[PDB]
Write a protein that binds this ligand. Structure first.
Ligand SMILES: [Cl-]
Length: 285
């Protein structure tokens, strides 16, 4: 009865959270692909001497105007026309790199660009590895960012821009603030069991969302190494689904469900737990 039903409930809960999360990534990626296509067509068809800053601006703002899940949008150009830099101080990082960075107005507005964008792992990977003709989207792990004064937990999605010589000339990308995923993943209205943990992590174990904010960005395998957690970690590592006996980082002997999903070349999982004691002696709340 209760054990079987709890397992089935946890599988259902994780599936729904996974589906919703996968859809948000998919929407962001479709927008990024649209703009990367349009910008590459521009940079292939337009001489450097004829590059038009307002044409570029309008492509960005038109693409990202419609209430995206992306909290930020950026265009990094490695070697733009010099007049680009003179158009706005916001387009210049501290080291003089050219980054057009947009945040929500609430529509999008330019904000001061930072080298934090240019130094993102996805950006560096694109500059080093991207080749014309690939259909690749570069997706990061959960990281700390600070673009407007306050820290937030984020993941980045980015695509190269190319010119007619088939060279990378820039990167168009987006930042998702995991607070916006936490809005549903940690909604107290969704708490079914006492001590239930709802977690988003990548397949490597790095946590994007955990009820304990102190655990965000950490690897679950490092902070919860007990043998009673390892079966669950294997499922995550392998990109599988299932429901397991699991001993959580807070010590609670639990049922845990995993629903694993892929996003382009990245791999993620939703983990949801129910302490066994909560399942069998739930409190009247
Ligand atoms: Cl990154």
């Amino acid at each position: 009865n209760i054990t079987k039903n709890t397992e089935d409930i946890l599988a259902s809960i994780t599936k729904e959270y996974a589906t919703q999360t996968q859809g948000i990534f998919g929407e962001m990626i479709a927008l990024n692909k649209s703009i990367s296509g349009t910008l590459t067509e521009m940079f292939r068809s337009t001489s450097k001497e004829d590059l038009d800053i307002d044409n570029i601006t309008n492509i960005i703002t038109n693409t990202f105007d419609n209430s995206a899940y992306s909290n930020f949008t950026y265009l990094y150009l490695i070697d733009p026309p010099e007049y680009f830099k003179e158009e706005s101080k916001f387009f210049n990082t501290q080291s003089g790199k050219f980054v057009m960075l947009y945040a929500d107005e609430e529509g999008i507005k330019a904000i001061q660009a930072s080298d934090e964008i240019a130094n993102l792992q996805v950006v560096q990977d694109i500059l080093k590895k991207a080749k014309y003709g690939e259909n690749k989207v570069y997706i990061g792990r959960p990281i700390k960012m600070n673009l407007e004064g306050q820290d937030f937990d984020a993941v980045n999605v980015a695509i190269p821009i190319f010119d007619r010589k088939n060279q990378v000339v820039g990167v168009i990308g987006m930042t998702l603030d995991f607070s916006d995923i936490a809005t549903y993943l940690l909604d107290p209205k969704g708490q079914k069991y006492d001590g239930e943990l709802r977690v988003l992590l990548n397949s490597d174990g790095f946590m994007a969302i955990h009820p304990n904010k102190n655990l965000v960005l950490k690897n679950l395998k490092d902070i919860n190494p007990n043998k009673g957690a390892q079966e669950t970690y294997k499922a995550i590592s392998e990109g599988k689904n299932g429901v397991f006996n699991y001993i959580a980082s807070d010590g609670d002997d639990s049922y845990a469900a995993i629903n694993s999903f892929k996003v382009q070349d990245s791999s993620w999982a939703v983990l949801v737990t129910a302490p066994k004691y909560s399942v069998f002696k739930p409190l009247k709340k």
